[PDB]
Amino acid sequence: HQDLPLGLMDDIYEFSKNFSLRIDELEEMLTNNRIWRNRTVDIGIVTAEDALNYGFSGVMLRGSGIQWDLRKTQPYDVYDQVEFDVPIGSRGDCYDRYLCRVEEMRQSIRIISQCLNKMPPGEIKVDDAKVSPPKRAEMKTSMESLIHHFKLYTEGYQVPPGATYTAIEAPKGEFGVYLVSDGSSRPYRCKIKAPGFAHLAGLDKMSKGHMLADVVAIIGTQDIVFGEVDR
Amino acid sequence: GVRTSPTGEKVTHTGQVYDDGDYRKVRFVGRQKEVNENFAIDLIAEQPVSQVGSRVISCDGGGGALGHPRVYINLDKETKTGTCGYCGLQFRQQ
Amino acid sequence: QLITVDEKLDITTITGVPEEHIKTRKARIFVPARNNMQSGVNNTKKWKMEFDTRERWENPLMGWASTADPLSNLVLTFSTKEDAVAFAEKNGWSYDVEERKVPKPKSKSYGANFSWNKRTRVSTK
Amino acid sequence: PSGEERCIACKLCEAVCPAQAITIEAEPRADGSRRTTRYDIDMTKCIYCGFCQEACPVDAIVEGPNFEFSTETHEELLYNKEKLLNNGDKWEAEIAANIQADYLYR
Amino acid sequence: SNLIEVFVDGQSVMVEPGTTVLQACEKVGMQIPRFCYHERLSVAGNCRMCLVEIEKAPKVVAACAMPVMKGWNILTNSEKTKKAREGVMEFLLANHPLDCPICDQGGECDLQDQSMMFGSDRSRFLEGKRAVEDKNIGPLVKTIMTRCIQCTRCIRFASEIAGVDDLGTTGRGNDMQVGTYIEKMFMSELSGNIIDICPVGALTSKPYAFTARPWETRKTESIDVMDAVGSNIVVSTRTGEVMRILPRMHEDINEEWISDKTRFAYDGLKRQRLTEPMVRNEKGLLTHTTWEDALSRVAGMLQSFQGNDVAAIAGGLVDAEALIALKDLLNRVDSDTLCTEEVFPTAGAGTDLRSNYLLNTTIAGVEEADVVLLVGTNPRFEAPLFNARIRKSWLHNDLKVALIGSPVDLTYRYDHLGDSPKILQDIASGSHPFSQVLQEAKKPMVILGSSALQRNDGAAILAAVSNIAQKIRTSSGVTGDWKVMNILHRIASQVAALDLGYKPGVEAIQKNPPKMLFLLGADGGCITRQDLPKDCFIVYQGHHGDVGAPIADVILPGAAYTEKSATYVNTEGRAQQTKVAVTPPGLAREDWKIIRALSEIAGMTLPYDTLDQVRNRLEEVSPNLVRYDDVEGANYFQQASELSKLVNQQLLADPLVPPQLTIKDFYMTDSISRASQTMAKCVKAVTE
Amino acid sequence: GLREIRIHLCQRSPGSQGVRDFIEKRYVELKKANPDLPILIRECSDVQPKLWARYAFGQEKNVSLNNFSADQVTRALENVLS
Amino acid sequence: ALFVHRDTPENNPETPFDFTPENYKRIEAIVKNYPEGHKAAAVLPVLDLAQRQNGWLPISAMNKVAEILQVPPMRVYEVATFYTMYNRK
Amino acid sequence: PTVKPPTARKFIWTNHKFNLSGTPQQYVPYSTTRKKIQEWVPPSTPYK
Amino acid sequence: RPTVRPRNDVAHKQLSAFGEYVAEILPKYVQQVQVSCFNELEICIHPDGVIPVLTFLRDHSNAQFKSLADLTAVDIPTRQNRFEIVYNLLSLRFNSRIRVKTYTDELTPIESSVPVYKAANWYEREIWDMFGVFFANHPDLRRILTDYGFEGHPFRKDFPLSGYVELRYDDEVKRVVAEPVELAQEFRKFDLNSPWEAFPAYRQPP
Amino acid sequence: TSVKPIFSRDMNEAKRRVRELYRAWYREVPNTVHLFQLDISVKQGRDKVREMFKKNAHITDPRVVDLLVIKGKMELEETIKVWKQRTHVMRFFHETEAPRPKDFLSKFYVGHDP
Numbered sequence A: 001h002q003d004l005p006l007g008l009m010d011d012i013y014e015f016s017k018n019f020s021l022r023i024d025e026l027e028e029m030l031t032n033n034r035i036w037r038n039r040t041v042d043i044g045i046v047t048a049e050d051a052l053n054y055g056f057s058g059v060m061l062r063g064s065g066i067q068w069d070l071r072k073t074q075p076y077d078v079y080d081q082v083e084f085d086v087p088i089g090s091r092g093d094c095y096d097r098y099l100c101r102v103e104e105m106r107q108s109i110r111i112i113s114q115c116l117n118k119m120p121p122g123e124i125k126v127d128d129a130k131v132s133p134p135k136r137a138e139m140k141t142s143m144e145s146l147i148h149h150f151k152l153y154t155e156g157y158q159v160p161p162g163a164t165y166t167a168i169e170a171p172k173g174e175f176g177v178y179l180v181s182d183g184s185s186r187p188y189r190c191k192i193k194a195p196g197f198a199h200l201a202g203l204d205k206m207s208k209g210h211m212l213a214d215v216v217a218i219i220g221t222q223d224i225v226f227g228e229v230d231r
Numbered sequence B: 001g002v003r004t005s006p007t008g009e010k011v012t013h014t015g016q017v018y019d020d021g022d023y024r025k026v027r028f029v030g031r032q033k034e035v036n037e038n039f040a041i042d043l044i045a046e047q048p049v050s051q052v053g054s055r056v057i058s059c060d061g062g063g064g065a066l067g068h069p070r071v072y073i074n075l076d077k078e079t080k081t082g083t084c085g086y087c088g089l090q091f092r093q094q
Numbered sequence C: 001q002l003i004t005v006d007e008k009l010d011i012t013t014i015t016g017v018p019e020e021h022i023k024t025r026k027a028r029i030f031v032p033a034r035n036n037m038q039s040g041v042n043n044t045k046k047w048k049m050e051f052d053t054r055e056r057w058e059n060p061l062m063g064w065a066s067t068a069d070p071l072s073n074l075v076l077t078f079s080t081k082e083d084a085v086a087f088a089e090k091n092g093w094s095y096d097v098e099e100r101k102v103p104k105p106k107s108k109s110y111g112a113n114f115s116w117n118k119r120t121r122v123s124t125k
Numbered sequence D: 001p002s003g004e005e006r007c008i009a010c011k012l013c014e015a016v017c018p019a020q021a022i023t024i025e026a027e028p029r030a031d032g033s034r035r036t037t038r039y040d041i042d043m044t045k046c047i048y049c050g051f052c053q054e055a056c057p058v059d060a061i062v063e064g065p066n067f068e069f070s071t072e073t074h075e076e077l078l079y080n081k082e083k084l085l086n087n088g089d090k091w092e093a094e095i096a097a098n099i100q101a102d103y104l105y106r
Numbered sequence E: 001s002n003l004i005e006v007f008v009d010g011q012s013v014m015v016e017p018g019t020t021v022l023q024a025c026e027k028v029g030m031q032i033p034r035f036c037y038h039e040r041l042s043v044a045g046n047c048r049m050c051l052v053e054i055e056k057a058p059k060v061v062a063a064c065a066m067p068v069m070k071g072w073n074i075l076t077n078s079e080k081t082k083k084a085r086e087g088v089m090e091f092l093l094a095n096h097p098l099d100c101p102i103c104d105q106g107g108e109c110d111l112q113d114q115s116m117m118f119g120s121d122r123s124r125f126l127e128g129k130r131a132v133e134d135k136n137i138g139p140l141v142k143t144i145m146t147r148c149i150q151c152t153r154c155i156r157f158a159s160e161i162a163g164v165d166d167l168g169t170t171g172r173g174n175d176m177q178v179g180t181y182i183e184k185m186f187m188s189e190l191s192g193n194i195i196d197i198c199p200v201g202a203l204t205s206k207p208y209a210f211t212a213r214p215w216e217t218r219k220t221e222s223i224d225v226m227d228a229v230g231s232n233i234v235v236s237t238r239t240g241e242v243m244r245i246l247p248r249m250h251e252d253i254n255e256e257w258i259s260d261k262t263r264f265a266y267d268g269l270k271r272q273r274l275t276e277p278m279v280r281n282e283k284g285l286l287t288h289t290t291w292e293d294a295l296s297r298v299a300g301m302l303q304s305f306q307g308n309d310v311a312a313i314a315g316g317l318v319d320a321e322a323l324i325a326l327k328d329l330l331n332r333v334d335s336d337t338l339c340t341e342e343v344f345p346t347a348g349a350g351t352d353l354r355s356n357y358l359l360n361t362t363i364a365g366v367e368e369a370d371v372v373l374l375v376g377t378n379p380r381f382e383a384p385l386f387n388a389r390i391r392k393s394w395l396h397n398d399l400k401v402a403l404i405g406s407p408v409d410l411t412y413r414y415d416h417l418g419d420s421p422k423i424l425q426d427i428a429s430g431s432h433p434f435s436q437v438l439q440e441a442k443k444p445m446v447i448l449g450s451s452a453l454q455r456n457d458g459a460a461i462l463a464a465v466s467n468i469a470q471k472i473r474t475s476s477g478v479t480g481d482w483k484v485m486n487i488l489h490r491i492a493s494q495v496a497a498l499d500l501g502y503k504p505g506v507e508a509i510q511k512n513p514p515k516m517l518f519l520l521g522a523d524g525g526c527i528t529r530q531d532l533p534k535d536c537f538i539v540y541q542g543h544h545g546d547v548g549a550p551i552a553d554v555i556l557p558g559a560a561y562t563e564k565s566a567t568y569v570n571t572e573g574r575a576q577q578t579k580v581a582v583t584p585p586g587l588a589r590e591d592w593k594i595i596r597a598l599s600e601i602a603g604m605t606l607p608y609d610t611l612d613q614v615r616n617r618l619e620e621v622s623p624n625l626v627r628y629d630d631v632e633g634a635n636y637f638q639q640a641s642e643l644s645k646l647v648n649q650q651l652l653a654d655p656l657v658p659p660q661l662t663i664k665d666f667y668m669t670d671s672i673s674r675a676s677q678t679m680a681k682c683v684k685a686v687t688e
Numbered sequence F: 001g002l003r004e005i006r007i008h009l010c011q012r013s014p015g016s017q018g019v020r021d022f023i024e025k026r027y028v029e030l031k032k033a034n035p036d037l038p039i040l041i042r043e044c045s046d047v048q049p050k051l052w053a054r055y056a057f058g059q060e061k062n063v064s065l066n067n068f069s070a071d072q073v074t075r076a077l078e079n080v081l082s
Numbered sequence G: 001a002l003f004v005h006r007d008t009p010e011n012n013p014e015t016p017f018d019f020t021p022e023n024y025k026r027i028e029a030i031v032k033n034y035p036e037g038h039k040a041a042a043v044l045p046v047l048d049l050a051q052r053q054n055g056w057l058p059i060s061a062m063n064k065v066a067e068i069l070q071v072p073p074m075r076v077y078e079v080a081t082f083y084t085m086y087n088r089k
Numbered sequence H: 001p002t003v004k005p006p007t008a009r010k011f012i013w014t015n016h017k018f019n020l021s022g023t024p025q026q027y028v029p030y031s032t033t034r035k036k037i038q039e040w041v042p043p044s045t046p047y048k
Numbered sequence I: 001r002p003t004v005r006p007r008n009d010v011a012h013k014q015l016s017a018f019g020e021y022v023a024e025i026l027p028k029y030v031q032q033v034q035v036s037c038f039n040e041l042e043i044c045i046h047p048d049g050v051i052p053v054l055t056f057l058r059d060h061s062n063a064q065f066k067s068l069a070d071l072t073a074v075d076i077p078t079r080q081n082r083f084e085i086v087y088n089l090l091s092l093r094f095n096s097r098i099r100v101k102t103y104t105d106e107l108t109p110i111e112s113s114v115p116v117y118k119a120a121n122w123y124e125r126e127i128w129d130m131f132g133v134f135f136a137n138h139p140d141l142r143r144i145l146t147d148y149g150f151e152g153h154p155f156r157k158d159f160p161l162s163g164y165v166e167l168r169y170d171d172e173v174k175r176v177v178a179e180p181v182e183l184a185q186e187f188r189k190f191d192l193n194s195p196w197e198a199f200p201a202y203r204q205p206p
Numbered sequence J: 001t002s003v004k005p006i007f008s009r010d011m012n013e014a015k016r017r018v019r020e021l022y023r024a025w026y027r028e029v030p031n032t033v034h035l036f037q038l039d040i041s042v043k044q045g046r047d048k049v050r051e052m053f054k055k056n057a058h059i060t061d062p063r064v065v066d067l068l069v070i071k072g073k074m075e076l077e078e079t080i081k082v083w084k085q086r087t088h089v090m091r092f093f094h095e096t097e098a099p100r101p102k103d104f105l106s107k108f109y110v111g112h113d114p
């Protein structure tokens, strides 16, 4: 919508400078803690093949050793221009998935460092006033700009008819949308693929032969937000 | 130009006021009727007409990009002022 | 292994629509008229189905338009008159079908504007 | 600055509002000006998305800086044009400064 | 046969010779962009938005004016075509004002939409814009002429369709302005249509100004009831309120036009409305009551009278559903005095044969006539869209038109034979020269206005005119299937009432004054309490408080035509139905439900409880009344003429003078238009 | 007594041929005999011809006239008028 | 200058203008130069003749020409404002 | 504001008001539009 | 061009060839194969082919579509078979996606795909819940998203947006009750479609 | 008219499944009244069950009957497993909804709806 305010990038740099230490303090409390390990190690084990067939994604796949990350395999935006490592687990349990998330946080800091250094100049929205609204100064001076502002904010832009399934590596796994266009300016159908929908469907499987308190840890390791599960 | 009706209720700049028999004015009992008292019709009529030396003048409301879309106003008629349809400022050829 | 049903397809009992919004509603099946403010014809291609307008009253608090008609905004699009009729029948809705109006072909002749002996001659351009 | 309302009842904000939280009616004012007679925002429908202030061509409707306006009743969150105009007169000193600081990014 | 082959992007099309490139593209389903071209006006070819590339030709052609040749391949999406559109759109917008937020066309603007689809997305115009002064042309059409794009649609419409040569272009070049030059008002019964055909916000509805945007309005396709033409309309509503009235295209009735009464009188529906039942208190003043009490009072009086002691009168805006319900109710107390305010001679056949009181040629059939004789009618104000159809035939078919009556302005030149009704005797006898024109004619048409039938000698006139049609059909001039005799009605409810067996006129009520009288929307003032026993019990059912309500004992608030699904039959006998756009105000109810409810309380319950059932009843009385949008056709003109000759009634000396002579008499004619503040501004403007 | 007569018929169908012949031959003579009686003839395409009679107090009777002849139609009205 | 007329005491529909008898004879010859049924072709020469008699074209002069040739007054206004040799002041 | 005071406007409130909810000065919503349909008023004389 | 999405010709050829491959191997069920301009391959199949087609794509060595990414339904009331069942599958081996579509109406059951993908269990419950499409041989087919006792299938095009009933707490009966829906402000329907064609490349024939 | 079936291949097969559903619903009412502590009588609950079955008696399409039985069994499970709360079970009775006028005159007085 808008360009970064002047001075924002320096502040993001200041935050990113100190963040790894904050992750280090988190690990000091949990990583080697025998109580934390007793609550997580060998809890909710899922095999690589079962994870794929149950429709898992994200850390739920990578905790079982599956080498899959949509940012690597099917990159979008500029993810193919940044360097990072995908954390992979070996035992497929809650503890390995916990370590994957903590390592993914470190890699996010690594990626943020490259974005701050490689940020290029230029415009922020597609220079195409039939999709992206023109600048307010243009809208108040140019006849074409005002017309396009008026139409984009009332009818909206029309999308050519068609259907796409588009997915990204969301923090919770593969988040996708099956978007159907009928040629008008309103979507005809919009199915939302929430990564937690399939994950919560696997809770029954993952909890077999565990204690009542291990269910708490297993819903925890899947990281469920019922906003996306329920839509 | 706020004013009160016979019942003592203030009339809004839109001309709204509950009539005598209207029960809906019970909502103000023990409270107040929110009324803005800077009537725009009266404030814009206090502005002095601007004298210009051309048949056509443009108005953007002032402030450049902080105003309204720029429009051009014809001043050929000498029986009336040219008014801006966005901000209500008036112009007259001198 | 397929079976045979000689009956008329009806699903009124398995759609969950209250009874009064089946039997008392009137569906209108029509091709929308061109908005006469514009010359575009792209909004007169498909068939629509709408229902009978019901009461809208003024909300006592704000003056907003209130309604108790759950089908007040329901508009369905159909490729053909027969797709619309079939959908109305299986849903149990009584309906009126209005035949599509097509603009009659015209005879446009620019030369007629300058006729030697006919009233089609224009006095101005 | 003259005191005339910026809003010209174009209804672009009402059209773009993702929540249908804006209700507008308009008519020619006694001086022939194109102005609203109703301008309501249901603050319990609004998602505070700012789309209305992006759509407005004259900077008439804005989201101000106030966030400390919780009420004791639902009805107090159904704003009409008088309430919104009073909010403009109340907060204009700060709204104008905020707009001055950000209008070059818009 | 005589078709020729052309291609649109390679797809073969067979077109009639003379078909333009634009018309060829329609067949394959492409709409070429346009501004100046309108299919019902003359080709202008000035906007240049329709420029298209013909394959192999180096120059783009104006598709709206260029006749397509054999073997041409029209490239409607080539770069040369696309760049032509972008260039023209760039020039149209160079001086256009940045007005969309304050402009009423915004949201349904062809300039906006064709800019989005066919123009560029930005500007490179770095100068200042043209600005022009506004023109005042009446209280209906607001002009913001800086928005004008000089398409000349208004000028062509005013001259060809309305027959008014008051709009033109003055000046030259970039400073060419559309207008009247002098301070003039464009006040025509069809004037409001230039709002629709102006592609931009230059011409806009003054009453509609600033009130709504097009995306938020709900559209209800309905029927006009301001005259007997039955013009198809769209009622725009928003949040329960009627916002405006637009034409709805119907080639066989109104085409895409409506009259200024149809367009603008709708504001009368918000004034002087009956919202509650009323009865007379002990002091003789009307006071609000309940539906319980008002219906019980009427049911009590109804149960105590029989036969001639109960009568009813139907006004000009009453639906067929209400008409048959009131007939059935009074037929259960044994009353047949079901009357209308509009007279039609009951001599001879009367209403036995439908052809005796219809526009038997149909409105579309005017375009096939070669001679039209108008008798005692100002069709310009009685049936504006029927008069516009005559001018279309006059302009395009070279139609010959003669008139008997006042020499009113019809917007086209015609042969005035005089106003004395004895000319009809001369024409039929053969002495008048015009009879030679009628005999030579191969498809002649005779129209007698229903207004002329309001005279005391209406029966003699109908016999005299019906005789002329007898003469033509005995000669060989006509092919048989062609119908010559026509009655032009002016009242929306007249034809349905005649179809249902109502007695036209209030002569029966004058002959046997009733003790109880129903006024069903009757506001013509044809019967007053001076025509009734000293203690007549008058019940008025209607939607407006005008002439009937003040004198009634009981008032029953009904619905207007925008507030019910009701059947109306137009002058040619076509049955059409309205639809509910908004519900009736207050406690008002659907008119046939009031009679159905009243019948139950009176102990004479009618045998129908839904709109579908009362329409099945309409089918029993006249099957044509439920054949919506169908013109049925009536025969036995021969039998009607034989019956019309039994009784010889003489013609009065009075010259035929139509009720409406000038435009000032056109605007206010029924209760709705009499309550319209827009119509009162029109009346004031054309006098002051 | 009798109050109204309505005759329905199709303009083109053979089922209404007899009724069409009656109107073209006998209707004028019938109306002259009964000048105070509404005999509403209403044509509509594809309708089965019928004869409606309205008696006092809204009582109604309808007699099919399908595939009737002109003389058969004459008798049917004679029954109503008698 | 402008292309819209506003009545003034010097220039209004009742400003006295009429062709002299000599100019009516000239008008007859001008009109005779064109096919019968196309008298509108005489608008330009007759407006010029009005201006040659009068010096300029008051609105009343324009209305007289429209009346002589039986063309709508607007169609004479369009000619008067289109061609630059006509003096409307 | 001591260093960069706000621009002066004559419609700007001279007196700031804090939150008035729960007091007799609280805002109470109402419809700001005028009545849409004017009813017919019968005559005051009993001519009937 | 800076504002135009670039075309990938190699993936369009690749997905076309694989589309013919699947059509040649499964002719009993495949009715149509198409690839979009943004390179998504869609297989349209007869509904009887759900299990054979999905099993082939999961298990075949050149397919290996091991992950069911999504399963949803689209309601198109104008069609005789109004419901379109859409399977979106992912192949990690070949780093590719495929979409498999079939159809059904209100009374015709579709075969549960739970045997092929355990992921389908809840998706089919959601399709049943929200569209009313029955899946045969489903281990536990019941509503999943709607309230207990909810009548109707909300994602059908002819189900009203605000439904038919609404909830409130009633003091007289001391419980939450359901009543016919009334709205203080009705939802305002907008007609936004422009009357001018936007995309000639998609024009339907006259 | 050759269509894929759901369960029943004809109406006689379907009627059997309908009767089993009625038995299951009939026997569960006394438990439902007790577990949910309803304030209706067992006879009232069973009358409602009959009312719900009754208003589908006109159906002659075996596929439609199977769906009606399928839906009815799901409702029974929700009740048997106590997934429904007290509020859900009592929605069949509309206790807070005032009686709706049915005759013409009553509907004419209240408003415009037929």
Ligand code: SF4
Binding pocket: D013, D016, D017, D018, D019, D020, D021, D022, D041, D045, D046, D047, D048, D049, D050, D051, D052, D053, D063
């Ligand atoms: S901020 Fe609120 S009122 Fe403005 S557009 Fe968003 S939801 Fe609507």
Ligand code: SF4
Binding pocket: D006, D007, D008, D009, D010, D011, D012, D013, D014, D024, D052, D055, D056, D057, D058, D059, D060, D061, E101
């Ligand atoms: S606030 Fe702005 S966008 Fe909304 S109606 Fe007023 S001027 Fe238009």
Ligand code: SF4
Binding pocket: A147, E096, E097, E098, E099, E100, E101, E103, E104, E105, E106, E107, E109, E110, E111, E112, E147, E199, E200, E201, E202
């Ligand atoms: S005519 Fe169209 S483009 Fe011109 S200002 Fe009005 S809405 Fe905008």
Ligand code: SF4
Binding pocket: E147, E148, E149, E150, E151, E152, E153, E154, E155, E178, E197, E198, E199, E200, E202, E203
């Ligand atoms: S006013 Fe409108 S219709 Fe007339 S020329 Fe200008 S744009 Fe065309």
Ligand code: FES
Binding pocket: E033, E034, E035, E036, E037, E044, E045, E046, E047, E048, E049, E050, E051, E062, E063, E064, E065
């Ligand atoms: S539409 Fe052809 S030039 Fe205007």
Ligand SMILES: [K+]
Binding pocket: E105, E194, E195, E196, E197, E198, E199, E200, E201, E202, E203, E204
């Ligand atoms: K316009």
Ligand SMILES: [Zn+2]
Binding pocket: B059, B060, B061, B068, B084, B085, B086, B087, B088, B089
């Ligand atoms: Zn301005």
